[PDB]
Design a protein around this nucleic acid. Sequence first.
DNA 1: ATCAATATCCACCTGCAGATTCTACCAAAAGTGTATTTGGAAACTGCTCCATCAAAAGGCATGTTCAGCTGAATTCAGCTGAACATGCCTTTTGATGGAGCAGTTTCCAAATACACTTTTGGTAGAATCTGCAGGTGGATATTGAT
DNA 2: ATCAATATCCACCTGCAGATTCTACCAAAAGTGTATTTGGAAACTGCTCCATCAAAAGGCATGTTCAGCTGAATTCAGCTGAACATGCCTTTTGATGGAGCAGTTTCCAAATACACTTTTGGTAGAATCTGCAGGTGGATATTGAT
Lengths: 104, 78, 83, 91, 93, 108, 98, 97
Amino acid sequence: AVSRSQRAGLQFPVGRIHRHLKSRTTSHGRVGATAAVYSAAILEYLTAEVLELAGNASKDLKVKRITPRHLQLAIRGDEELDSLIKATIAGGGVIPHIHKSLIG
Amino acid sequence: NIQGITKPAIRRLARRGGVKRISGLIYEETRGVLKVFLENVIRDAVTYTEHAKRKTVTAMDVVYALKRQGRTLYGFGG
Amino acid sequence: RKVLRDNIQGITKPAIRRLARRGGVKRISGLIYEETRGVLKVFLENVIRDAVTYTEHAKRKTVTAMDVVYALKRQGRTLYGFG
Amino acid sequence: KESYSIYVYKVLKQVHPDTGISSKAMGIMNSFVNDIFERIAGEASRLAHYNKRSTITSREIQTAVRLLLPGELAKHAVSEGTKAVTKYTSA
Amino acid sequence: SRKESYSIYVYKVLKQVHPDTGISSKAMGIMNSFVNDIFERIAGEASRLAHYNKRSTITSREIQTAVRLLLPGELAKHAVSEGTKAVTKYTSA
Amino acid sequence: RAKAKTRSSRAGLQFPVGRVHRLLRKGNYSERVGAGAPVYLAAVLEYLTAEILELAGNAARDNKKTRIIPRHLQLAIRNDEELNKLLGRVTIAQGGVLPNIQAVLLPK
Amino acid sequence: PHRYRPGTVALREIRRYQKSTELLIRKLPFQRLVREIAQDFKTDLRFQSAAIGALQEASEAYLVGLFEDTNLCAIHAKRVTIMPKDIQLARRIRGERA
Amino acid sequence: PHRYRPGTVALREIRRYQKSTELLIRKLPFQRLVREIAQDFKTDLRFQSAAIGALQEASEAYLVGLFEDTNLCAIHAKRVTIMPKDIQLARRIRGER
DNA sequence: ATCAATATCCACCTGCAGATTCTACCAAAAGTGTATTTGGAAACTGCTCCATCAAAAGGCATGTTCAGCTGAATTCAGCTGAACATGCCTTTTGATGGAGCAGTTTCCAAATACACTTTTGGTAGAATCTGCAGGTGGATATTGAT
DNA sequence: ATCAATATCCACCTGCAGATTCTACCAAAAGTGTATTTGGAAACTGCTCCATCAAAAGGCATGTTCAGCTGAATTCAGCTGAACATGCCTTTTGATGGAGCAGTTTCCAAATACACTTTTGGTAGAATCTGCAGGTGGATATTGAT
Ligand SMILES: [Cl-]
Ligand SMILES: [Cl-]
Ligand SMILES: [Cl-]
Ligand SMILES: [Cl-]
Ligand SMILES: [Mn+2]
Ligand SMILES: [Mn+2]
Ligand SMILES: [Mn+2]
Ligand SMILES: [Mn+2]
Ligand SMILES: [Mn+2]
Ligand SMILES: [Mn+2]
Ligand SMILES: [Mn+2]
Ligand SMILES: [Mn+2]
Ligand SMILES: [Mn+2]
Ligand SMILES: [Mn+2]
């Protein structure tokens, strides 16, 4: 007692993130005392935001565990998460959409 | 080996892409497109491998290669 | 001092037509001009928003060329010739 | 070999105590956290250098967040960041 | 106040490839933006390469690999030649 | 002590090895920088500069101009497959475009 | 009374403007637009002259590049006339709007 | 007997494969393809199983995304059938060609 | 839409097999207690250079008229691509056993950092130098109507 | 085919705004010295990888119909291009006025440094359950037809 993540009321590691910031910002560079805390809070927020939407879909499909598919549905189903993450979600598939001109 | 990428395989990819009807010329065209994509990715992935003085292409080499061309892939270490 | 209003309409029809010509366009629908103005404003909003963000971070009240250049690079629209 | 698995799992129990997560989905979350961290740190690094600073502070992180996150995400992220720093600087 | 630029070096190279040809200020500004851009790309890629391989030193080997990644083909071969030649000539005291 | 010999001249370069070395050092790209790293980088930057200037210089000549303008730089980059690829996401100010009219648009 | 047929002058304009590099949007009206947009973010902002010029070079290059893709979409639909529909397709494939 | 009209089974396959996430290319042909391409740079490289997996996930995600834009180009031309011209247009807009 | 008639989904289930979660080391690393240094904020201050006005010329936007030809429907059939059943097999699965090549230590000669002290290549500004922008022309297409 | 009307190509001209060259001061590379890391170069690991291989299990290739899609062809309403006069407003240039970059100096709040101890998280097996296999009984949903 007491860890820096605890004092900031976070689950994400302030200490590790501080060290990561201290990496490619060399010893010739510097890192603020609260920069790690602030950075940790953002990562935890975004993680929670993604996990909540994904967790919903997993239960909406009556499944206990979150799968890559649930993550894909949660991201592409959210306008802002979709624009933020233009990465490829492995094993996530695509959102089911058929063009209206294709249906008889 | 590019012919190993079969017509029903290419077809399944088109279905997931929401394609209803497929021209016969598509399959050869798709094989050509896929090859160029793979060439570019593998060229960079092997380059990362040689720099590390390794003879084994790791998943991280691929991820780094995909990231460099703006094709970020999640779920393989990086 | 003076109020700036409705300046997207300052992007005239002949100006938009000239841009299309350089783009190789031979014939233009009448609805293009309003659409082009819409597309341009969204583009300018996005670039300037980031540029001003760089300006505000620098605690400046003057947008520099570098603020714009940085903003363009971040959006994958790298511009040469302005420092 | 480091990972964010433990922390992702801890956050998951906050928002969904009843829900678990597959191994492959965890690898995606790991890639996600690493990606976002690199984006923010990289932008924060450039912000400091542009202004001839050698120190990355929470002010650089905040501006980077405003540049990288699209709208409502940005507002809440900035709020969570400020909230966490304020609680940190208290003790 | 002094503002550094690559202008004098671009102009020196200009006289080597076209001794009769000059260049406008706006075209010189483009060349400066180009040099700064390529520098930023190569240095950034070499930095990540060192980080990926857990090295604390960016050497000419990192620069070379970065070049082979960023330059598309014959440009890569020719740049590697100029890079290697300059190094070997430099290491020859 | 010995007479000053610039690292550029030692490398047979026109681009400043020392300045490039300083820029690598203050960009915090790494904790340490090798001796040959700024040499290699300066050589690459110099060659690429030469490549663009050569082709731009050529374009100026066929336009019978003795001064390179942005238009010549654009004509040089977009007409070269590898420079166009390298600068595919780059805007050249006052460069204009390459002349190109789709065949179907031309008269009968 | 001489009169060129539809499309003849259009093709004539294409070759003229593809040959030149000058800005196609008037400087002053573009300045107002930039200042109007920016001051909607931060009141009483000042601008370096080169800052506005940078935005215009980038803006025109973007629109010209978009009209290229737009044109190709029109030709693809066997038309010679570009339409909003063509722009929307081009920007969609670009990932700008979907 | 029974015979589905052209389009019915096609629409069915779309729903089935958009609903699932499994790889659609057989593993061995793709693995063999990767090695041949790689050997033109470096002969007999060792490949991690995850390395090939990453390449295949990316390859299929790429092609599926391309078929989507390809489909849009076909629809735009008031067609339901995708053609090489549709792929060529999509890749041109992307800056791939 | 009935009416009936196949072909497929598709959610009420189940039972292990295999993923997840849980466990327990224990080295890595975060945290701590001090001691020391230092980047950078802050308070001026000099001096670009930015905002706004003014006019005056004339380039060019605007609004109009009008018909050429294009986009939009529409029709039709030649032919291509979908649906299908049927054999053949390429891929898939699964050990067995080598092994090649990861990654891991523990030494020093080589390499790099960082300061001091001098030197000189690089810049700002002034002084020169001079393409070519913008003007003027015939010559050579190109175009569209008899 | 011919011409008339128009535009573009291309060469001419010069002077001045823009580009190049010159001039010295000085910021910052260069030379030289320590002090400090570092990355090979040995000598050693257990590990995913390669290779069959042995069949075998879904999965592709193949040929035959025919449904219906694509492309050609036709028609016409009306929109968009071309050409024109009109005169507004952009362009150009110069002026003020001064907001506010950017330079500069001081000196602490905010960083790094260091030698430790405490805490944590990565790891691999055991211990735990959760879906993935399938598998229907049963409406969808599609299809030919009255
Ligand atoms: Cl801070
Ligand atoms: Cl080196
Ligand atoms: Cl439309
Ligand atoms: Cl085609
Ligand atoms: Mn030459
Ligand atoms: Mn306003
Ligand atoms: Mn100081
Ligand atoms: Mn038509
Ligand atoms: Mn028929
Ligand atoms: Mn000198
Ligand atoms: Mn001229
Ligand atoms: Mn001094
Ligand atoms: Mn100390
Ligand atoms: Mn623990």
